[PDB]
Amino acid sequence: DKPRGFARGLDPERIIGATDSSGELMFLMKWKDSDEADLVLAKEANMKCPQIVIAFYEERLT
Amino acid sequence: PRGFARGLDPERIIGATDSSGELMFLMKWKDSDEADLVLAKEANMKCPQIVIAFYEERL
């Protein structure tokens, strides 16, 4: 089932978790108007939806 | 002029605290050795990549 991540063309809604178990930081991105949440590279989310990334960190780290 | 009103580009957030009542960043500007406290809310909007790099370096 393709596409995944930002390729779905959905608006990002909220990051609901983060993992670096692969060696690269990834976020679990919940998509607006969807029940789908996909891992996306943090580098990609940082650039495309920085306020969503910042919101996640404020929730988790503050 | 201190803070963003200095008109200097941010280099990096040195540290963070909420001892003021709100989340604040201690901000290093490029072109200065003098760090300023800025509200996280301001930095989030004016330099989101600098804010993100701080959080990434932490977690």
Q: Which residues pair with A30 in a beta bridge?
A: A14, A37
Residue listed under structure tokens 């108007």: A33
Rounded Cα distance, A12 and B13, in Å:
26
Q: For the domain bounded by B1-59, which CATH number is listed?
A: 2.40.50.40
Considering only alpha carbons, which residue of chain B is nearest residue A50? B48
| CA-based radius of gyration for chain A | 11
> CB–CB of A50 and B55 under 8 A?
no
| Experimental technique for the deposited model | X-ray
Rounded Cα distance, A6 and A45, in Å:
9
If residue A55 lies in a helix (H) or strand (E), which one and from where to where? helix A50-61
- The phi and psi torsions of A40 (rounded to 5 degrees) equal -130, 150
Tokens at residue B30, please? Answer: 């490029």
Helix (H, G, I), strand (E, B) or coil at A27: strand
- The phi and psi torsions of B34 (rounded to 5 degrees) equal -100, 120
**How many CB pairs below 8 A link A and B?**
30
Rounded Cα distance, B27 and A45, in Å:
23
Tokens at residue B38, please? Answer: 């800025």
Tell me which fold the domain A1-62 belongs to. Answer: OB fold (Dihydrolipoamide Acetyltransferase, E2P) (2.40.50)
Contacts of residue B42, defined as CB under 8 A and 6 or more positions apart, other chains included, come to B3, B4
Contact (CB, 8 A) for B29 and B10: yes
Q: What distance in Å separates residue B51's CA from the closest CA in chain A?
A: 7
Tell me which residue in B48, B49, B59 faces A61 most closely, judged by beta carbons. Answer: B59
